[PDB]
Ligand binder design. Sequence first.
Ligand SMILES: CCCc1c(O)ccc2c(-c3cnc(-c4cnc(C(=O)O)c(O)c4)s3)[nH]nc12
Ligand SMILES: [Cl-]
Ligand SMILES: [Mg+2]
Ligand SMILES: [Mg+2]
Ligand SMILES: [Mg+2]
Ligand SMILES: [Mg+2]
Length: 193
Amino acid sequence: GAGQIQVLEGLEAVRKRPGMYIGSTSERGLHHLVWEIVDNSIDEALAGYANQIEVVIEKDNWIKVTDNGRGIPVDIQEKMGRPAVEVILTSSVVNALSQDLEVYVHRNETIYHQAYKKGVPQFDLKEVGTTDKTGTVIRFKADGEIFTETTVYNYETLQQRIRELAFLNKGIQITLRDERDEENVREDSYHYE
Ligand SMILES: CCCc1c(O)ccc2c(-c3cnc(-c4cnc(C(=O)O)c(O)c4)s3)[nH]nc12
Ligand SMILES: [Cl-]
Ligand SMILES: [Mg+2]
Ligand SMILES: [Mg+2]
Ligand SMILES: [Mg+2]
Ligand SMILES: [Mg+2]
């Protein structure tokens, strides 16, 4: 009960003063969404559990982030009575500030899925398939109501920072791919020693 009320209030808080959370609602804050997700994958590699991160700019400026870590856990929490992944994603700034967000978890030889709008789950987490891999996929579309200047990402901005992050975090393979124009797909992949 109380825990879920505090999630809703957290969502209202983020969406009311987004600049207080991501710095700005300009092009800078739009790209900050990517960094918030990529940092969580980087943590999972530094913990010893992932070594590959993929960032795709999809049609209509969805972003897809994929890592080969353990998979965000799906076990039910004592505190929230909800799957752990739902708790982690409902308190995410990126989810609060996205019109839509999807997660796919590969864990327990199972694929789990949940979708959200403005941070609100659209349906309970569900098993959708099977897998012999572990990791996590997050796809989101920035909310144009928040990001009033632009919701268009800059490949070069993303490329520069991805290359910095792979240089800093040696051993992680970080790939950027732009699929916005299906006729000309660009990829850069970074992997330092
Ligand atoms: C593309 C997604 C980016 C991305 C996020 O935004 C957010 C969380 C993410 C994580 C994980 C978080 N917690 C994890 C874990 C897994 N297993 C155990 C265990 O004990 O087995 C455990 O304690 C913890 S994985 N990975 N990636 C994430
Ligand atoms: Cl689990
Ligand atoms: Mg963070
Ligand atoms: Mg962390
Ligand atoms: Mg983080
Ligand atoms: Mg490596």
